[model samples]
Target: HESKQSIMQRILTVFVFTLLIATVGLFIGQFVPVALMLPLSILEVAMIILAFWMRRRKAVGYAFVYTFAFVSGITLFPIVSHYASIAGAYVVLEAFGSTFVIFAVLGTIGAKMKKDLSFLWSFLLVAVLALAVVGIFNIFSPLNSAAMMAYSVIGTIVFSLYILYDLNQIKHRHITEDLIPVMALSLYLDFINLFINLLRFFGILSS
Candidate 1:
């Protein structure tokens, strides 16, 4: 039987693996055109959804499909950044490093304190929805560096909280073995959002 400690270790292993894969993808994306990258991203999202559905339905075929999709998505980052100039690359790196540190610090704190973070879920969801709406508006209106920075700060907080929440879920065994795919997907998305928001704050890409 896997003790809680052993299970925690395994979860960390998976998280590290996913992060490494995502880093490599981002590095590779530096050379790929954005046009190609968008389609790949869409494909990855589809795969994640499929995996979630399959897991829920206990479909073995979708399990493999989901795995492939998730791994490929991580690897696609490098290609996505390919069109990014030198400054863009730096932004990507900064976002990646900052996000990692924030998550690590918060995750450790949550684990040691063992606090209930469930209350944060509703707030996070609402914040994300508001951010999305603002993002669309910003895309059509004048760009504001200050506003972007503010968003970045909020993003860092929310995503770090997400890391803490996810860790707590695993610690409490609220997530079963069958939910690993969804768990991974959730973390992956959080990291991705963190990176994108940070990049925006850096103003690496012209609006």
Candidate 2:
């Protein structure tokens, strides 16, 4: 088994690099035609599925993980660009800053606390499924401002708890070298969802 510290360190390093790569893609995404957005998102989802299948293979899976991150950033461009257009780029940064602070705090608590959080999985799974179902229905009957705010708030809390759950797993579990990138991808996904919901929350307020 690898040293716990090194495993976390490697995972964090992978996460940062992929995040940068995603940022690059985000900038690049601005120049692409809007028509390509859905295609790129489908590709991104495929990459994620492939990454999970091949994670232990290392050769293909690592590339899949990074590529997924970049493409995911590309897909986010429209949402981010729209918000920036509405309010200001400052809103984007505000969401990111909030995510960073929340992630760090949750990370610290998850890593240092000895309590087992594996039990959280069941509730989180149900919460996410319920959110997705309700979200789809909400599209037909759009919620009022107050209701939307409440929805976004709940979304933020759910993903924030995800950050805690994931970090706790990372700290207590045995992670292999080949699995590092995939694990990083998990955190990356957590951060992305957290950012998106936060952006939506801020976007609503500023709109």
Candidate 3:
């Protein structure tokens, strides 16, 4: 069996690798066209699904690649276009700042908490479904600013809880040795959701 120190080292290695992949993907995404971006996004989603159903090690590798592709695709939009307005820039900044603080607080709490956060999965799934419904509705309807704001708030909460859950899984040794892929996948999804919702709330996308 691996020592606690070894497990911690492995976790750190995964975190660092994930960060580097996400950063590089974001930078490259800026230059890619939307046409290619959309396809890559689809492919990444498929890979994630596949990863979830396979061996943990394989899943982790696939999750890392998918994350790299997904981040790159998102960055392309802002790189090729521009923010909607000054208000959009402010919103983006607010989202980034708020997300950082929330993650930090949750991380600290997760380190100290002994409860099983996996129980949150069902609630998060339902919340995400509701969020998706509302978002799609707004796309075709009046797109009320207040509604968007509410959605953003909910998204922040859901994703932040996800961060705690994922971290707790690692800290509590709730996964198998081969489960690194699933672990990385969970972390990547949480991070991306948090970032995307923040972007939407802040009106960072170009009109």
Best by TM-score: 2
Q: Lowest lDDT 10-mer window, candidate 1?
A: 51-60
Full-model lDDT, candidate 1: 0.56
Clashing pairs in 3: 29-72, 29-76, 60-181
Full-model lDDT for every candidate: 0.56, 0.75, 0.58
Worst 10 residues of 3 by lDDT: 39-48
Tens digit per residue, CA lDDT, model 3, 38-134: 4322332332233233314344465554565456445534522343253545665565567667766786687558886767756766766666666
- Winner by lDDT: 2
Regarding TM-score, does 1 or 2 come out ahead?
A: 2
lDDT value, residue 66 of candidate 3: 55
Residue by residue across 1-207, what tens digits does model 1's lDDT show? 667676666656665666666556545555655555554324323432332233232422325434543565555564335324536556656666777787788667766666676677677666666665555555457446676568656765666676677677667655555555556555556666655555555643442
- Given candidate 2, what's the lDDT at residue 26? 87
TM-score of each: 0.70, 0.85, 0.70
Candidate 2 lDDT by residue in tens digits, 1-207: 678898899888888888899999888889988775553223323332332233232433678778988987877788787767777989999999999899999988997899989899778777766666556556556677678678778878887997899889888776678778778887787777778778878977998
Which portions of model 1 show Cα errors greater than 4 Å? 34-88, 203-207
Candidate 3: stretches off by over 4 Å = 33-58, 62-94, 139-142, 204-207
